[PDB]
Amino acid sequence: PPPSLEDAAPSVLRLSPLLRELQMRAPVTKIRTPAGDEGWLVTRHAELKQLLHDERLARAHADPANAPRYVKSPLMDLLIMDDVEAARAAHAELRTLLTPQFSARRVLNMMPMVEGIAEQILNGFAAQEQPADLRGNFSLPYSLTVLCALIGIPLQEQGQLLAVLGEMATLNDAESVARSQAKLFGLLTDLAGRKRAEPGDDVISRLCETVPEDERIGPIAASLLFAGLDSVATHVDLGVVLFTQYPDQLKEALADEKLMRSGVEEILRAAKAGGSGAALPRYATDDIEIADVTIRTGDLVLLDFTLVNFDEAVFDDADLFDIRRSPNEHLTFGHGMWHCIGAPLARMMLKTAYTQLFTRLPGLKLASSVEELQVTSGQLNGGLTELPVTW
Ligand SMILES: C[C@@H]1[C@H](O)[C@@H](C)/C=C/C=C/C=C/C=C/C=C/C=C/C=C/[C@H](O[C@@H]2O[C@H](C)[C@@H](O)[C@H](N)[C@@H]2O)C[C@@H]2O[C@](O)(C[C@@H](O)C[C@@H](O)[C@H](O)CC[C@@H](O)C[C@@H](O)CC(=O)O[C@H]1C)C[C@H](O)[C@H]2C(=O)O
Ligand code: HEM
């Protein structure tokens, strides 16, 4: 029986020993998923990068109901279709719709909105009673408010979102996920009809121009919001932890915009809970020969973007936080057909956050120890349960 991927990591910002062992054993290796099934874990940079460009991996399985699962989640099950050409076309359309929204030009047009929301939230955060949770008081409201503004979700309708998005991340209750997913899909399909009638400068309105069916705009906007919210918030949090542990690198990043940009890359490479970094399931649509192994049609393949970021064949002293790594060859956003569509926004949001946070609160420090930080578990893209800081 293959080793089981565990529920989190023993502590934050260090790769879990089980993952480091799996990586040493083989480039592609059989594991047991949290959901109990068997799967291929890709553990090394060169092999992951090659498989990110292999057309034989798809979000498709001949029998999705019986396909080997990564996690027990009705969210993943919406992702997997039973025809390959139908899955390929659905994926292709998602990227065609969304890639223009995140061009360098359009992201540049988001900067004032992002900086302005960060300043309003930071104004309130600096006044909180200390120690204060940076995640609930800053990084989550920051991420939620920017993403809702860009997508076009009214301030008047945001109250219920943090509850529904958090529930959708649960691996603990299958029926609570599915009805939260429908609440969110229903909220945003309803919203799409309203913005069709009254368009604004936002993503939902621009999708209306090209997509005439509300019932398919809503799930795209919902999955856009779910894709960005926690990941951006968690990287604000862990980026803040790293910078409080290497204050000399924080100060030089504040002093030179080149080093703040490469500092954000080094946070994207290393600011990790240390647990399993695979995000979505992929299935072989044909047999693939690689790394002295044979992946078979229907097999589950897990691309662990976090784990390959610590591959010593690529990164000198990989456990070390060093913002001067350049070029920084992390694969945190994927690559090729699968590459994160929000990467330019995420990069800009993180740079905005660290700059404003540490300029306004230069004495920002952990209330307790890094070892005392509690990584969340039993969840999709959980990060920390809270991050108490003082300043
Ligand atoms: C075909 C389909 C239909 O037409 C439509 C009706 C279907 C809609 C279905 C949508 C389903 C969406 C499911 C998303 C699940 C994310 C899980 C994330 C878990 C992440 C993992 O976390 C772990 O999980 C383990 C279990 C725990 O053991 C462990 N303790 C920890 O918790 C790893 C962490 O990952 C990253 O965070 C970033 C992700 O967050 C990025 C993600 O968000 C993507 O961006 C989501 C992209 C997604 O949206 C693509 C869809 O859009 C494509 C799409 O819709 O196709 C349409 C055309 C960053 C962290 O550094 C990772 C780290 O920790 O090292
Ligand atoms: C630090 C923040 C983020 C990280 C680490 C991250 C990471 C990732 C990763 C690893 C994938 C590939 C998933 C897979 O195929 O296994 C992905 C895909 C995706 N990301 Fe991000 N992401 C971040 C922020 C965002 C944001 C803010 C948005 C939207 C505003 C977004 C939208 C998407 C979408 C739509 C996909 C699916 C792409 C596809 O199916 O081809 N991401 N992201």
Side-chain angles (χ1 to χ4, degrees):
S4 190
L5 306 173
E6 245 162 311
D7 199 44
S11 55
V12 171
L13 297 167
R14 43 82 59 99
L15 191 71
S16 94
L18 165 66
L19 288 180
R20 206 142 31 195
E21 186 42 56
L22 280 165
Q23 169 173 87
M24 274 180 291
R25 277 255 44 90
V28 187
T29 183
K30 276 165 291 180
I31 47 81
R32 175 194 286 109
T33 62
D37 291 324
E38 209 179 293
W40 296 102
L41 181 64
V42 182
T43 74
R44 296 189 194 167
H45 191 277
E47 280 78 11
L48 192 125
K49 219 182 55 56
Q50 182 188 312
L51 287 168
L52 281 169
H53 299 280
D54 197 310
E55 165 248 293
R56 290 165 293 183
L57 290 182
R59 293 169 179 152
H61 193 279
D63 182 7
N66 295 31
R69 285 181 295 178
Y70 182 22
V71 292
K72 292 169 180 283
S73 175
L75 236 72
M76 307 294 201
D77 303 322
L78 250 201
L79 197 69
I80 309 301
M81 305 174 55
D82 73 338
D83 169 33
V84 175
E85 285 202 346
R88 204 226 55 102
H91 186 213
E93 185 209 31
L94 185 74
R95 292 193 69 83
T96 293
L97 291 170
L98 293 176
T99 288
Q101 311 306 323
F102 293 85
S103 75
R105 168 173 53 78
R106 284 216 183 267
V107 167
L108 177 63
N109 294 344
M110 305 166 193
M111 298 196 49
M113 177 271 290
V114 171
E115 292 181 47
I117 287 161
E119 170 179 13
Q120 286 302 311
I121 292 166
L122 176 53
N123 283 345
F125 178 73
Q128 294 310 292
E129 178 65 43
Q130 297 184 35
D133 173 24
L134 186 122
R135 178 174 235 266
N137 288 293
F138 177 87
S139 72
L140 274 171
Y142 173 54
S143 186
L144 173 70
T145 306
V146 172
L147 288 178
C148 288
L150 172 63
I151 294 171
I153 299 173
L155 282 170
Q156 298 88 343
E157 304 183 51
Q158 287 170 213
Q160 67 205 293
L161 289 189
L162 242 33
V164 170
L165 293 166
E167 203 62 21
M168 284 173 61
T170 307
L171 310 178
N172 187 24
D173 180 352
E175 206 202 353
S176 181
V177 173
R179 291 167 321 195
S180 306
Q181 158 142 94
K183 280 227 54 178
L184 185 62
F185 283 21
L187 170 49
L188 286 145
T189 52
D190 170 30
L191 177 59
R194 290 185 266 129
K195 306 218 68 162
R196 192 179 304 277
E198 173 69 42
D201 170 20
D202 46 71
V203 177
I204 286 179
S205 293
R206 294 189 277 282
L207 298 180
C208 286
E209 303 168 359
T210 152
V211 176
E213 301 90 339
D214 302 331
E215 52 279 3
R216 72 165 3 269
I217 284 187
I220 296 180
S223 67
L224 248 191
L225 183 65
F226 188 81
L229 171 80
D230 261 320
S231 57
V232 168
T234 289
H235 280 85
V236 179
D237 295 332
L238 295 172
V240 168
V241 183
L242 279 168
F243 272 138
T244 68
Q245 296 308 91
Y246 302 84
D248 49 337
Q249 298 186 71
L250 182 265
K251 264 124 67 193
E252 65 193 43
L254 252 13
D256 193 10
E257 289 256 309
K258 293 308 182 85
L259 292 187
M260 179 56 74
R261 274 183 288 266
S262 66
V264 163
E265 296 310 303
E266 179 68 350
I267 279 154
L268 288 168
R269 180 190 74 86
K272 311 302 179 185
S276 149
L280 302 181
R282 292 163 163 77
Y283 299 99
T285 62
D286 281 289
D287 292 359
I288 303 167
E289 304 288 321
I290 190 182
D292 307 314
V293 105
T294 292
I295 310 181
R296 308 286 182 170
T297 303
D299 287 351
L300 164 64
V301 179
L302 302 171
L303 307 182
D304 192 318
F305 304 108
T306 293
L307 174 51
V308 307
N309 287 348
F310 295 87
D311 179 349
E312 287 286 344
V314 172
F315 303 93
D316 192 29
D317 299 318
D319 296 333
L320 176 65
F321 184 69
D322 171 22
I323 70 173
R324 292 177 182 278
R325 282 179 208 276
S326 193
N328 191 324
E329 40 279 317
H330 69 74
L331 278 164
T332 292
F333 291 126
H335 223 237
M337 301 177 287
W338 304 109
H339 182 261
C340 167
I341 303 192
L345 176 64
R347 284 180 162 108
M348 216 226 70
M349 291 180 72
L350 293 176
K351 180 168 169 283
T352 295
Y354 305 137
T355 297
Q356 294 205 19
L357 220 27
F358 284 102
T359 301
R360 168 77 38 92
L361 309 174
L364 190 63
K365 61 204 281 272
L366 277 0
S368 63
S369 162
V370 184
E371 85 204 69
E372 300 198 287
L373 294 181
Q374 297 238 302
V375 18
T376 122
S377 61
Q379 278 209 289
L380 290 179
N381 46 38
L384 299 167
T385 66
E386 73 167 349
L387 175 54
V389 297
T390 72
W391 60 86

